[PDB]
Amino acid sequence: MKVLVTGFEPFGGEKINPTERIAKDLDGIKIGDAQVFGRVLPVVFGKAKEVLEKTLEEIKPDIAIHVGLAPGRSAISIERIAVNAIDARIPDNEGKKIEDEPIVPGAPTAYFSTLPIKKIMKKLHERGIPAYISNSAGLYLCNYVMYLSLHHSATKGYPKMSGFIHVPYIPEQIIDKIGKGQVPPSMCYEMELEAVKVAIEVALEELL
Template identity: 50%
Template sequence: MMKTLLLTGFEPFLDHASNPTEKIVKQLNGETIGEFTVIGKVLPVAFDESTVVLMEAEKEVNPDAVIMLGLAAGRSNITPERIAINIQGGAADNKGVKLQDESILENGPACYFSTLPIQSFVETLHEQNIPASISNTAWNISMQ
């Protein structure tokens, strides 16, 4: 039986004319990869919308797995995240809203640990001579 993968990316933001995650999501939407059918969803770069759109997509698709892509412009390799922190903030979003250390889910835990095989992802990328390493958080200096 075919499983469903919800794959998300983001629209362009800041001074980026395009966002590779948007292109990846659109290209893979509807494709079958292994035992998964990919359902792609491009999220808005707006603090008040992105979580809502994500939760609606999750409810609609009811996926077996979710992979969320993001652009980390200062990084030179692919970096699957080990931990998603329950904080939003940094540069202004596409609506001009700037947040500092705001919870994404008000009563949610401080963080969520990935249940995906991220070490295997990195090893597979290395086998293809693609630079990759595990990151413990998407938060970095360029976001502040």
């Protein structure tokens, strides 16, 4: 079984993106008898599409789990829906901000995630990791690769399971926000990584 786990580079503002570390730390491990690959996507619409599609073609994973930073979220959120729209608030890392374009013209308005989101959520709860299901992943790069991946699954037949997991800030990112008079929630890195490993394990146990 191959599993692709992606993460992103530092989105605008942040100096660190914990999903870049989760991708690198899971690269090359084996969970059960499944090889796990970990790749870090650019936060550039276009280039991220190019890279995501080469990686999908090249590895042909059975399960792809895309992970991103959700600033200000307080628990792990498992994404339910990806939607066919880009309405970027911030610019991407090249400086382009896209207001209301579709991702794939004429492709469906939305795709539901194919990961077993409620079993992933229940198992995370059993391990004491607070987690919930979110119904919107945003309309910037996190939703763009979540849509592109489930579109690829519908079109080409693989990956067989695709989905997105958003993670809080890790504590070390909070301490310079304190300075600007704000203290957003955080989760420690080790719980974040453990969470996307539990996700890979219950996706594998479902996927035959």
